[PDB]
Amino acid sequence: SDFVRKLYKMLEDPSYHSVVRWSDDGDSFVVLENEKFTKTILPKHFKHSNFASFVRQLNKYDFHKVRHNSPYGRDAWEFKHPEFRADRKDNLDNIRRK
Amino acid sequence: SDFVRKLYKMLEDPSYHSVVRWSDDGDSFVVLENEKFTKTILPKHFKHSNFASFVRQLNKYDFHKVRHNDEPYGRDAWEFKHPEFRADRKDNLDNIRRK
DNA sequence: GGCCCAGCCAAAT
DNA sequence: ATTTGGCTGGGCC
């Protein structure tokens, strides 16, 4: 998948660490800030600067937002797909448009 | 019931001029710095800080995002518009209903 | 009423 | 003709 491969490539660069990174477990990823992501990082990896079109694409590939009851950030967004993991770089094509 | 009046009230505040305000013609409103808007202004007036929800409510009330085309307020600006929602029509807010 | 996720068309490919 | 971006809507809670 084109989008998925690019999502994983994004999460390789540590310069982004404080803004968008893998979670501690490595089984989900966290968008910690929004503005610098939306303005600086989204454009460089995807064809938009619109956080919500990013979100929309995630739901199309069956990623789900993980709901907090605070753990990562006040206004952080965490997304998780069962197959999308830091250690499973091989299994990316298994993630596909619902 | 409450949304439209509060939205109108929000736009009565000039201190927010750089962030969110009425459009030149007073017939639509524009969010210019949605980070600042989202994190400072939204909670004040609607008690959440998620732009997506603000957008969702807007569509529920039949507001529409006004797609700009080359020739606005910045490309990261979001302009929203309802025929009956206007700077000079504080009297008409009841006719803006959940579609 | 906030919010996740999806419908549906257009804008790109 | 097919894919990707984005405005809008459905429905849980």
Side-chain angles (χ1 to χ4, degrees), chain A residues 1-4 6-34 36-73 75-87 89-98, chain B residues 1-34 36-46 48-66 68-70 72-99:
Chain A
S1 175
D2 209 19
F3 172 85
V4 181
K6 296 226 253 288
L7 195 75
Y8 188 97
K9 204 163 185 184
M10 196 177 68
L11 300 169
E12 280 174 351
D13 180 328
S15 301
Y16 307 155
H17 193 262
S18 40
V19 176
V20 64
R21 53 147 184 263
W22 285 103
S23 50
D24 312 340
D25 287 42
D27 50 20
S28 60
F29 78 89
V30 193
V31 172
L32 290 159
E33 247 67 23
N34 265 227
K36 207 195 157 196
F37 181 73
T38 300
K39 290 300 211 81
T40 306
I41 308 183
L42 251 178
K44 280 169 188 171
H45 295 271
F46 300 94
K47 162 41 215 172
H48 43 92
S49 94
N50 189 353
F51 186 67
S53 312
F54 177 65
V55 167
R56 188 72 193 83
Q57 261 285 34
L58 287 171
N59 293 148
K60 279 176 195 179
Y61 279 88
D62 205 3
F63 289 79
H64 294 270
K65 183 164 188 196
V66 177
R67 286 138 112 164
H68 308 307
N69 56 68
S70 38
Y72 289 99
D75 281 25
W77 295 63
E78 162 159 32
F79 295 88
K80 182 174 202 157
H81 190 284
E83 318 206 61
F84 184 82
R85 307 182 95 170
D87 49 59
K89 186 178 170 94
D90 167 62
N91 307 31
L92 294 178
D93 286 303
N94 228 342
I95 307 156
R96 56 183 81 200
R97 295 163 169 282
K98 273 179 179 281
Chain B
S1 68
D2 198 45
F3 179 72
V4 176
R5 295 195 264 89
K6 287 198 161 171
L7 177 62
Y8 189 95
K9 181 54 170 158
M10 192 182 76
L11 303 162
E12 278 176 6
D13 197 347
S15 46
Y16 306 149
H17 202 261
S18 54
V19 173
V20 65
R21 57 169 195 269
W22 286 96
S23 48
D24 303 6
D25 322 282
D27 61 4
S28 59
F29 82 92
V30 185
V31 168
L32 277 136
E33 287 159 75
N34 67 297
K36 269 153 139 280
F37 176 75
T38 296
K39 292 144 214 175
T40 64
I41 304 185
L42 258 193
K44 231 285 197 75
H45 294 276
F46 302 92
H48 64 77
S49 48
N50 185 334
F51 187 71
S53 292
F54 181 57
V55 170
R56 188 68 194 92
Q57 265 289 65
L58 291 171
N59 288 148
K60 281 193 176 191
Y61 278 80
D62 212 354
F63 280 76
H64 289 295
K65 185 167 178 206
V66 175
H68 112 253
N69 79 291
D70 102 300
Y73 297 90
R75 209 136 309 174
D76 62 318
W78 288 63
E79 182 180 354
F80 285 95
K81 177 163 197 165
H82 192 292
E84 307 297 298
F85 188 74
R86 319 185 207 120
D88 71 347
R89 303 296 301 164
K90 190 170 168 95
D91 71 334
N92 199 20
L93 304 166
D94 303 326
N95 218 299
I96 302 165
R97 305 154 187 180
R98 293 188 182 187
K99 61 152 58 187

